[PDB]
mmCIF file of C-alpha atoms (C1' of nucleotides) and ligand atoms in Angstrom:
data_model
loop_
_atom_site.group_PDB
_atom_site.id
_atom_site.type_symbol
_atom_site.label_atom_id
_atom_site.label_comp_id
_atom_site.label_asym_id
_atom_site.label_seq_id
_atom_site.Cartn_x
_atom_site.Cartn_y
_atom_site.Cartn_z
ATOM 1 C CA UNK A 1 10.231 10.945 12.500
ATOM 2 C CA UNK A 2 7.907 10.770 15.694
ATOM 3 C CA UNK A 3 9.978 10.769 18.557
ATOM 4 C CA UNK A 4 10.729 14.184 17.728
ATOM 5 C CA UNK A 5 7.264 15.163 16.296
ATOM 6 C CA UNK A 6 5.230 17.710 18.116
ATOM 7 C CA UNK A 7 8.502 19.537 18.658
ATOM 8 C CA UNK A 8 9.232 19.892 15.117
ATOM 9 C CA UNK A 9 5.864 20.578 14.416
ATOM 10 C CA UNK A 10 5.701 23.653 16.634
ATOM 11 C CA UNK A 11 9.249 24.626 15.374
ATOM 12 C CA UNK A 12 7.834 25.013 11.906
ATOM 13 C CA UNK A 13 4.988 26.786 12.972
ATOM 14 C CA UNK A 14 6.992 29.016 14.807
ATOM 15 C CA UNK A 15 9.408 29.599 11.537
ATOM 16 C CA UNK A 16 6.061 29.920 9.231
ATOM 17 C CA UNK A 17 4.941 32.542 11.428
ATOM 18 C CA UNK A 18 8.095 34.457 11.353
ATOM 19 C CA UNK A 19 8.547 34.296 7.500
ATOM 20 C CA UNK A 20 4.940 35.408 6.924
ATOM 21 C CA UNK A 21 3.352 37.552 9.598
ATOM 22 C CA UNK A 22 6.440 39.155 10.396
ATOM 23 C CA UNK A 23 9.254 39.854 8.162
ATOM 24 C CA UNK A 24 11.793 37.761 10.094
ATOM 25 C CA UNK A 25 13.853 35.719 7.633
ATOM 26 C CA UNK A 26 16.707 34.792 10.165
ATOM 27 C CA UNK A 27 14.376 33.854 12.964
ATOM 28 C CA UNK A 28 12.603 31.951 10.421
ATOM 29 C CA UNK A 29 15.580 30.643 9.141
ATOM 30 C CA UNK A 30 16.558 29.848 12.355
ATOM 31 C CA UNK A 31 13.659 27.682 13.444
ATOM 32 C CA UNK A 32 13.873 25.721 10.439
ATOM 33 C CA UNK A 33 17.180 24.322 10.668
ATOM 34 C CA UNK A 34 16.343 23.524 14.114
ATOM 35 C CA UNK A 35 13.274 21.821 13.083
ATOM 36 C CA UNK A 36 15.782 20.157 10.969
ATOM 37 C CA UNK A 37 18.495 18.535 13.181
ATOM 38 C CA UNK A 38 15.783 17.590 15.819
ATOM 39 C CA UNK A 39 14.090 15.745 13.437
ATOM 40 C CA UNK A 40 17.466 13.833 12.517
ATOM 41 C CA UNK A 41 17.947 13.305 16.185
ATOM 42 C CA UNK A 42 17.516 9.730 17.173
ATOM 43 C CA UNK A 43 16.714 9.758 20.620
ATOM 44 C CA UNK A 44 13.657 11.523 22.678
ATOM 45 C CA UNK A 45 14.222 15.225 23.477
ATOM 46 C CA UNK A 46 13.884 15.204 27.079
ATOM 47 C CA UNK A 47 14.866 18.495 27.876
ATOM 48 C CA UNK A 48 15.975 21.690 26.508
ATOM 49 C CA UNK A 49 19.610 21.777 27.514
ATOM 50 C CA UNK A 50 19.656 18.291 25.720
ATOM 51 C CA UNK A 51 18.086 19.822 22.608
ATOM 52 C CA UNK A 52 20.438 22.724 22.886
ATOM 53 C CA UNK A 53 23.493 20.471 22.705
ATOM 54 C CA UNK A 54 22.428 20.646 18.952
ATOM 55 C CA UNK A 55 23.820 22.461 16.598
ATOM 56 C CA UNK A 56 21.479 25.627 15.663
ATOM 57 C CA UNK A 57 19.730 25.265 19.294
ATOM 58 C CA UNK A 58 20.286 28.026 20.997
ATOM 59 C CA UNK A 59 18.898 28.899 24.308
ATOM 60 C CA UNK A 60 15.901 30.758 22.859
ATOM 61 C CA UNK A 61 14.546 27.965 21.047
ATOM 62 C CA UNK A 62 15.413 25.673 23.980
ATOM 63 C CA UNK A 63 13.432 27.816 26.105
ATOM 64 C CA UNK A 64 10.474 26.930 23.931
ATOM 65 C CA UNK A 65 11.220 23.319 23.889
ATOM 66 C CA UNK A 66 11.029 23.102 27.690
ATOM 67 C CA UNK A 67 7.820 25.073 27.877
ATOM 68 C CA UNK A 68 6.400 22.694 25.321
ATOM 69 C CA UNK A 69 7.909 19.688 26.752
ATOM 70 C CA UNK A 70 6.557 20.870 30.484
ATOM 71 C CA UNK A 71 2.987 21.910 29.450
ATOM 72 C CA UNK A 72 1.174 20.568 26.137
ATOM 73 C CA UNK A 73 1.271 23.856 24.769
ATOM 74 C CA UNK A 74 3.320 27.220 23.686
ATOM 75 C CA UNK A 75 1.927 30.818 24.492
ATOM 76 C CA UNK A 76 3.373 32.226 21.847
ATOM 77 C CA UNK A 77 2.132 29.720 19.646
ATOM 78 C CA UNK A 78 -1.394 30.296 21.412
ATOM 79 C CA UNK A 79 -1.222 33.921 21.171
ATOM 80 C CA UNK A 80 -0.269 33.872 17.153
ATOM 81 C CA UNK A 81 -2.644 30.652 16.402
ATOM 82 C CA UNK A 82 -5.375 33.010 17.969
ATOM 83 C CA UNK A 83 -4.216 36.708 16.381
ATOM 84 C CA UNK A 84 -6.766 37.969 13.571
ATOM 85 C CA UNK A 85 -3.949 39.896 12.042
ATOM 86 C CA UNK A 86 -1.774 37.141 11.557
ATOM 87 C CA UNK A 87 -4.824 34.986 11.071
ATOM 88 C CA UNK A 88 -5.340 36.888 8.332
ATOM 89 C CA UNK A 89 -2.310 36.738 6.401
ATOM 90 C CA UNK A 90 -2.605 33.184 6.933
ATOM 91 C CA UNK A 91 -5.791 32.937 4.458
ATOM 92 C CA UNK A 92 -5.334 35.784 1.878
ATOM 93 C CA UNK A 93 -2.135 33.992 1.086
ATOM 94 C CA UNK A 94 -4.269 31.126 -0.226
ATOM 95 C CA UNK A 95 -5.099 33.175 -3.294
ATOM 96 C CA UNK A 96 -3.342 32.450 -6.208
ATOM 97 C CA UNK A 97 -1.283 35.266 -7.145
ATOM 98 C CA UNK A 98 -1.464 36.487 -3.373
ATOM 99 C CA UNK A 99 2.071 36.200 -1.444
ATOM 100 C CA UNK A 100 2.675 37.083 2.039
ATOM 101 C CA UNK A 101 4.082 40.702 0.997
ATOM 102 C CA UNK A 102 0.716 41.516 -0.763
ATOM 103 C CA UNK A 103 -0.760 39.576 2.052
ATOM 104 C CA UNK A 104 0.729 42.014 4.665
ATOM 105 C CA UNK A 105 -0.351 45.246 2.475
ATOM 106 C CA UNK A 106 -4.001 43.866 1.932
ATOM 107 C CA UNK A 107 -4.461 43.227 5.803
ATOM 108 C CA UNK A 108 -2.883 46.915 6.478
ATOM 109 C CA UNK A 109 -5.724 48.404 4.348
ATOM 110 C CA UNK A 110 -8.130 46.364 6.282
ATOM 111 C CA UNK A 111 -8.840 43.549 3.312
ATOM 112 C CA UNK A 112 -9.113 40.370 5.862
ATOM 113 C CA UNK A 113 -11.596 38.582 4.209
ATOM 114 C CA UNK A 114 -12.297 36.786 0.843
ATOM 115 C CA UNK A 115 -15.461 39.354 0.639
ATOM 116 C CA UNK A 116 -13.082 41.908 1.320
ATOM 117 C CA UNK A 117 -11.046 40.978 -1.496
ATOM 118 C CA UNK A 118 -14.210 41.087 -4.105
ATOM 119 C CA UNK A 119 -15.331 44.504 -2.999
ATOM 120 C CA UNK A 120 -11.852 45.512 -3.846
ATOM 121 C CA UNK A 121 -11.083 43.474 -6.558
ATOM 122 C CA UNK A 122 -10.033 46.509 -8.101
ATOM 123 C CA UNK A 123 -7.005 46.589 -6.125
ATOM 124 C CA UNK A 124 -6.143 42.817 -7.552
ATOM 125 C CA UNK A 125 -4.007 42.625 -10.460
ATOM 126 C CA UNK A 126 -4.976 39.793 -13.014
ATOM 127 C CA UNK A 127 -3.537 36.825 -11.799
ATOM 128 C CA UNK A 128 -4.861 37.595 -8.220
ATOM 129 C CA UNK A 129 -7.997 38.424 -10.013
ATOM 130 C CA UNK A 130 -8.201 35.134 -11.599
ATOM 131 C CA UNK A 131 -7.330 33.684 -8.134
ATOM 132 C CA UNK A 132 -10.113 35.141 -6.279
ATOM 133 C CA UNK A 133 -12.189 34.072 -9.146
ATOM 134 C CA UNK A 134 -11.286 30.503 -9.182
ATOM 135 C CA UNK A 135 -11.014 30.381 -5.682
ATOM 136 C CA UNK A 136 -12.788 27.159 -4.697
ATOM 137 C CA UNK A 137 -11.860 25.252 -7.564
ATOM 138 C CA UNK A 138 -8.152 26.247 -6.982
ATOM 139 C CA UNK A 139 -8.476 24.313 -4.144
ATOM 140 C CA UNK A 140 -10.363 21.014 -5.384
ATOM 141 C CA UNK A 141 -7.855 17.988 -6.048
ATOM 142 C CA UNK A 142 -8.283 16.691 -9.682
ATOM 143 C CA UNK A 143 -9.589 13.253 -10.022
ATOM 144 C CA UNK A 144 -7.383 11.104 -12.155
ATOM 145 C CA UNK A 145 -10.853 10.157 -14.038
ATOM 146 C CA UNK A 146 -10.294 13.630 -15.028
ATOM 147 C CA UNK A 147 -6.584 13.548 -15.088
ATOM 148 C CA UNK A 148 -7.058 11.147 -17.935
ATOM 149 C CA UNK A 149 -9.692 13.208 -19.851
ATOM 150 C CA UNK A 150 -7.398 16.693 -19.861
ATOM 151 C CA UNK A 151 -4.614 14.428 -21.000
ATOM 152 C CA UNK A 152 -6.387 13.099 -23.678
ATOM 153 C CA UNK A 153 -7.347 16.519 -24.821
ATOM 154 C CA UNK A 154 -4.035 17.956 -24.565
ATOM 155 C CA UNK A 155 -2.435 15.245 -26.523
ATOM 156 C CA UNK A 156 -4.802 15.332 -29.201
ATOM 157 C CA UNK A 157 -4.154 19.070 -30.046
ATOM 158 C CA UNK A 158 -0.491 19.015 -29.858
ATOM 159 C CA UNK A 159 -0.466 16.379 -32.341
ATOM 160 C CA UNK A 160 -3.215 18.013 -34.567
ATOM 161 C CA UNK A 161 -0.906 21.310 -34.494
ATOM 162 C CA UNK A 162 2.456 19.415 -35.267
ATOM 163 C CA UNK A 163 3.054 15.994 -35.194
ATOM 164 C CA UNK A 164 6.540 16.333 -34.254
ATOM 165 C CA UNK A 165 5.566 17.624 -30.737
ATOM 166 C CA UNK A 166 6.340 15.588 -27.543
ATOM 167 C CA UNK A 167 4.549 15.903 -24.683
ATOM 168 C CA UNK A 168 4.505 14.675 -21.002
ATOM 169 C CA UNK A 169 1.766 14.921 -18.567
ATOM 170 C CA UNK A 170 4.338 14.571 -15.680
ATOM 171 C CA UNK A 171 3.763 14.673 -12.046
ATOM 172 C CA UNK A 172 2.057 12.291 -9.743
ATOM 173 C CA UNK A 173 -0.316 11.555 -12.363
ATOM 174 C CA UNK A 174 2.603 10.100 -14.003
ATOM 175 C CA UNK A 175 3.063 8.115 -10.899
ATOM 176 C CA UNK A 176 -0.505 7.045 -10.814
ATOM 177 C CA UNK A 177 -1.543 9.327 -8.284
ATOM 178 C CA UNK A 178 -5.575 8.622 -7.441
ATOM 179 C CA UNK A 179 -5.445 12.501 -7.383
ATOM 180 C CA UNK A 180 -3.381 15.351 -8.196
ATOM 181 C CA UNK A 181 -3.341 19.012 -7.551
ATOM 182 C CA UNK A 182 -2.827 20.299 -11.171
ATOM 183 C CA UNK A 183 -1.635 19.363 -14.548
ATOM 184 C CA UNK A 184 2.075 19.836 -15.962
ATOM 185 C CA UNK A 185 2.544 19.223 -19.375
ATOM 186 C CA UNK A 186 6.480 18.929 -20.598
ATOM 187 C CA UNK A 187 6.668 20.054 -23.792
ATOM 188 C CA UNK A 188 9.390 19.922 -26.668
ATOM 189 C CA UNK A 189 9.720 19.340 -29.868
ATOM 190 C CA UNK A 190 12.690 18.511 -32.492
ATOM 191 C CA UNK A 191 13.581 21.700 -33.567
ATOM 192 C CA UNK A 192 14.216 23.187 -30.189
ATOM 193 C CA UNK A 193 17.434 22.251 -28.186
ATOM 194 C CA UNK A 194 20.382 23.776 -26.320
ATOM 195 C CA UNK A 195 21.665 25.905 -29.151
ATOM 196 C CA UNK A 196 19.059 26.505 -31.724
ATOM 197 C CA UNK A 197 17.915 29.675 -30.966
ATOM 198 C CA UNK A 198 14.459 29.523 -29.828
ATOM 199 C CA UNK A 199 10.995 29.412 -31.577
ATOM 200 C CA UNK A 200 8.691 30.887 -29.335
ATOM 201 C CA UNK A 201 5.890 30.322 -31.523
ATOM 202 C CA UNK A 202 6.547 26.573 -30.596
ATOM 203 C CA UNK A 203 4.968 27.473 -27.292
ATOM 204 C CA UNK A 204 2.422 30.020 -28.815
ATOM 205 C CA UNK A 205 1.114 27.721 -31.377
ATOM 206 C CA UNK A 206 0.074 24.883 -28.910
ATOM 207 C CA UNK A 207 -1.564 27.499 -26.681
ATOM 208 C CA UNK A 208 -3.699 28.801 -29.066
ATOM 209 C CA UNK A 209 -4.799 25.446 -29.836
ATOM 210 C CA UNK A 210 -5.763 24.632 -26.542
ATOM 211 C CA UNK A 211 -7.682 27.901 -25.948
ATOM 212 C CA UNK A 212 -9.177 27.578 -29.410
ATOM 213 C CA UNK A 213 -11.381 24.441 -28.574
ATOM 214 C CA UNK A 214 -11.971 25.953 -25.357
ATOM 215 C CA UNK A 215 -9.552 23.715 -23.055
ATOM 216 C CA UNK A 216 -7.508 26.923 -21.838
ATOM 217 C CA UNK A 217 -9.642 29.449 -20.391
ATOM 218 C CA UNK A 218 -7.480 31.938 -19.109
ATOM 219 C CA UNK A 219 -3.767 32.925 -19.044
ATOM 220 C CA UNK A 220 -1.930 33.127 -15.488
ATOM 221 C CA UNK A 221 1.101 33.857 -17.392
ATOM 222 C CA UNK A 222 2.714 33.341 -20.772
ATOM 223 C CA UNK A 223 5.804 34.122 -22.081
ATOM 224 C CA UNK A 224 8.259 32.149 -24.546
ATOM 225 C CA UNK A 225 8.961 29.073 -22.557
ATOM 226 C CA UNK A 226 6.242 29.000 -19.912
ATOM 227 C CA UNK A 227 2.527 29.139 -19.937
ATOM 228 C CA UNK A 228 0.720 29.217 -16.746
ATOM 229 C CA UNK A 229 -3.157 28.826 -16.989
ATOM 230 C CA UNK A 230 -6.405 27.701 -16.089
ATOM 231 C CA UNK A 231 -8.265 25.174 -17.819
ATOM 232 C CA UNK A 232 -11.620 23.149 -18.164
ATOM 233 C CA UNK A 233 -13.393 20.126 -19.482
ATOM 234 C CA UNK A 234 -16.243 20.917 -21.434
ATOM 235 C CA UNK A 235 -19.422 20.391 -19.404
ATOM 236 C CA UNK A 236 -21.109 17.474 -20.734
ATOM 237 C CA UNK A 237 -24.786 16.954 -21.535
ATOM 238 C CA UNK A 238 -25.240 19.630 -18.653
ATOM 239 C CA UNK A 239 -26.383 19.099 -15.102
ATOM 240 C CA UNK A 240 -22.769 18.890 -14.043
ATOM 241 C CA UNK A 241 -19.879 21.465 -15.172
ATOM 242 C CA UNK A 242 -16.455 20.968 -14.689
ATOM 243 C CA UNK A 243 -14.120 22.866 -11.885
ATOM 244 C CA UNK A 244 -11.406 25.644 -13.025
ATOM 245 C CA UNK A 245 -7.954 24.040 -12.943
ATOM 246 C CA UNK A 246 -4.348 25.237 -12.954
ATOM 247 C CA UNK A 247 -2.326 23.829 -15.532
ATOM 248 C CA UNK A 248 1.566 24.987 -16.763
ATOM 249 C CA UNK A 249 3.048 23.913 -19.726
ATOM 250 C CA UNK A 250 6.753 24.332 -20.469
ATOM 251 C CA UNK A 251 8.528 24.433 -23.920
ATOM 252 C CA UNK A 252 12.012 22.309 -23.833
ATOM 253 C CA UNK A 253 14.991 21.815 -25.985
ATOM 254 C CA UNK A 254 14.556 18.144 -27.125
ATOM 255 C CA UNK A 255 17.988 17.778 -26.033
ATOM 256 C CA UNK A 256 17.152 17.923 -22.251
ATOM 257 C CA UNK A 257 13.761 16.375 -22.122
ATOM 258 C CA UNK A 258 14.099 13.244 -20.012
ATOM 259 C CA UNK A 259 16.068 14.605 -17.694
ATOM 260 C CA UNK A 260 13.495 17.449 -17.198
ATOM 261 C CA UNK A 261 10.978 14.900 -17.452
ATOM 262 C CA UNK A 262 12.608 12.697 -14.964
ATOM 263 C CA UNK A 263 12.953 15.396 -12.777
ATOM 264 C CA UNK A 264 9.318 16.642 -12.731
ATOM 265 C CA UNK A 265 7.982 13.190 -12.211
ATOM 266 C CA UNK A 266 9.824 12.695 -9.021
ATOM 267 C CA UNK A 267 8.987 11.687 -6.499
ATOM 268 C CA UNK A 268 11.123 14.128 -4.517
ATOM 269 C CA UNK A 269 12.632 11.271 -2.892
ATOM 270 C CA UNK A 270 12.872 9.205 -5.797
ATOM 271 C CA UNK A 271 14.873 12.360 -7.160
ATOM 272 C CA UNK A 272 17.310 12.788 -4.445
ATOM 273 C CA UNK A 273 17.770 9.037 -4.335
ATOM 274 C CA UNK A 274 18.174 8.752 -7.754
ATOM 275 C CA UNK A 275 20.306 11.620 -7.596
ATOM 276 C CA UNK A 276 22.565 10.445 -4.654
ATOM 277 C CA UNK A 277 23.238 7.274 -6.868
ATOM 278 C CA UNK A 278 24.379 9.110 -10.265
ATOM 279 C CA UNK A 279 27.282 10.397 -7.884
ATOM 280 C CA UNK A 280 28.990 7.415 -6.930
ATOM 281 C CA UNK A 281 28.460 5.827 -10.125
ATOM 282 C CA UNK A 282 30.676 8.466 -11.371
ATOM 283 C CA UNK A 283 27.840 11.359 -12.216
ATOM 284 C CA UNK A 284 25.893 14.319 -11.714
ATOM 285 C CA UNK A 285 22.020 14.923 -12.409
ATOM 286 C CA UNK A 286 20.049 18.175 -12.368
ATOM 287 C CA UNK A 287 17.032 19.567 -13.820
ATOM 288 C CA UNK A 288 18.342 19.314 -17.712
ATOM 289 C CA UNK A 289 21.370 16.901 -17.970
ATOM 290 C CA UNK A 290 23.850 14.287 -16.636
ATOM 291 C CA UNK A 291 27.351 14.798 -16.518
ATOM 292 C CA UNK A 292 30.119 12.431 -15.978
ATOM 293 C CA UNK A 293 32.013 12.961 -12.756
ATOM 294 C CA UNK A 294 35.504 14.216 -13.444
ATOM 295 C CA UNK A 295 37.764 13.129 -10.780
ATOM 296 C CA UNK A 296 39.846 16.452 -10.338
ATOM 297 C CA UNK A 297 36.804 17.256 -8.033
ATOM 298 C CA UNK A 298 34.314 18.324 -10.757
ATOM 299 C CA UNK A 299 34.110 17.760 -14.424
ATOM 300 C CA UNK A 300 31.385 18.667 -17.037
ATOM 301 C CA UNK A 301 30.114 17.228 -20.475
ATOM 302 C CA UNK A 302 26.257 16.238 -21.141
ATOM 303 C CA UNK A 303 25.571 12.988 -21.928
ATOM 304 C CA UNK A 304 23.176 12.304 -24.742
ATOM 305 C CA UNK A 305 19.848 10.776 -23.436
ATOM 306 C CA UNK A 306 16.941 9.704 -25.913
ATOM 307 C CA UNK A 307 14.836 8.494 -23.135
ATOM 308 C CA UNK A 308 14.438 7.931 -19.576
ATOM 309 C CA UNK A 309 16.020 4.744 -19.797
ATOM 310 C CA UNK A 310 19.458 6.380 -21.025
ATOM 311 C CA UNK A 311 19.719 8.028 -17.732
ATOM 312 C CA UNK A 312 18.978 4.693 -15.608
ATOM 313 C CA UNK A 313 21.722 2.795 -18.009
ATOM 314 C CA UNK A 314 24.009 5.434 -17.396
ATOM 315 C CA UNK A 315 23.838 5.382 -13.818
ATOM 316 C CA UNK A 316 23.185 1.588 -14.286
ATOM 317 C CA UNK A 317 20.262 1.333 -12.102
ATOM 318 C CA UNK A 318 17.183 -0.541 -12.592
ATOM 319 C CA UNK A 319 14.296 1.040 -15.028
ATOM 320 C CA UNK A 320 11.977 2.430 -12.662
ATOM 321 C CA UNK A 321 8.274 2.511 -14.027
ATOM 322 C CA UNK A 322 6.938 5.632 -12.990
ATOM 323 C CA UNK A 323 4.326 3.898 -10.937
ATOM 324 C CA UNK A 324 7.502 2.905 -8.720
ATOM 325 C CA UNK A 325 8.980 6.159 -8.542
ATOM 326 C CA UNK A 326 7.510 6.596 -5.418
ATOM 327 C CA UNK A 327 10.997 6.412 -3.294
ATOM 328 C "C1'" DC B 1 16.330 27.790 -8.861
ATOM 329 C "C1'" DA B 2 13.883 30.122 -12.443
ATOM 330 C "C1'" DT B 3 10.607 32.435 -15.461
ATOM 331 C "C1'" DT B 4 6.898 36.193 -15.753
ATOM 332 C "C1'" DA B 5 4.544 40.015 -13.931
ATOM 333 C "C1'" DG B 6 4.596 44.525 -12.569
ATOM 334 C "C1'" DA B 7 5.224 49.213 -11.562
ATOM 335 C "C1'" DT C 1 15.077 47.876 -12.805
ATOM 336 C "C1'" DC C 2 13.540 45.333 -8.513
ATOM 337 C "C1'" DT C 3 10.659 42.752 -6.278
ATOM 338 C "C1'" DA C 4 7.288 39.355 -6.184
ATOM 339 C "C1'" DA C 5 5.152 35.020 -6.875
ATOM 340 C "C1'" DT C 6 4.497 30.221 -8.714
ATOM 341 C "C1'" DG C 7 6.355 26.322 -9.654
HETATM 342 NA NA1 NA D 401 24.244 24.491 20.306
HETATM 343 NA NA1 NA D 402 -1.166 32.378 -2.584
HETATM 344 NI NI1 NI D 403 2.607 22.231 -10.515
HETATM 345 NI NI1 NI D 404 1.703 19.189 -9.572
#
DNA sequence: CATTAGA
DNA sequence: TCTAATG
């Protein structure tokens, strides 16, 4: 956690670089497992060899580990850290909709910078266009102050179109989070569950609604169960407008909401932890259900959940207010 | 770990 | 269809 720091960080930088700039999944895949066990390692890694003894530690990484131990740096790391080609991929990548593949290809054509990107806005697809469009706001964190306003609106409409709708702004926001990076709305309605053959309009309806009044301003992608957009608080009595923000809404079969809800609320840790516990207590938990553990090894059987509580009850835990879903 | 675009 | 991208 700190004894192993610098080693694991460089190990990560190393990996990142392979996976992006280059296309070396393995190398990249290599660096991480390494980066992983060395972090679990309980003692100060004092030398290559010492590390090397690890699983996942080859001579290659060892080699690097020495050089790093030896001198506060690493050349390849210094060289990569400098490299404009590589530097660039690192950047373009930020743009919403721009992955590494694309990052590499733009770079090859010479689009390095943002400006470059604009001039060739033609080469960019919708998503990416939008990305480039809201580049700045895409980066800004959302204040819960605003987080609250947004939520106020969304629930308001959802209700309006259908009083039967169930919506939950999941995420950190749900966890008190002073700030948040983007809104996640979990949707479900009673007339949509595991079996009942869809009702696409169900998603569609509300979407309309939300753009209707001007909350949704664009569509990143919209399909029958997952809307992905941009949205924004009405600019008041002017002098101050609101930044464009990423927002996702997903429809769910009412017969899986709470797991789903549980699930997105997280935190990552709250999850696994709640996850490892449901296990001893004879169960299995995942993004949509909870199934009693069968002795024969495994077993199925979706238990009936009517709220986040039911889930705990099941695994017999303490109802954890989201506030304290932190770990 | 899956859903949507795209080409 | 595959392959990319976001979550
Ligand atoms: Na080894
Ligand atoms: Na990106
Ligand atoms: Ni998100
Ligand atoms: Ni989020």
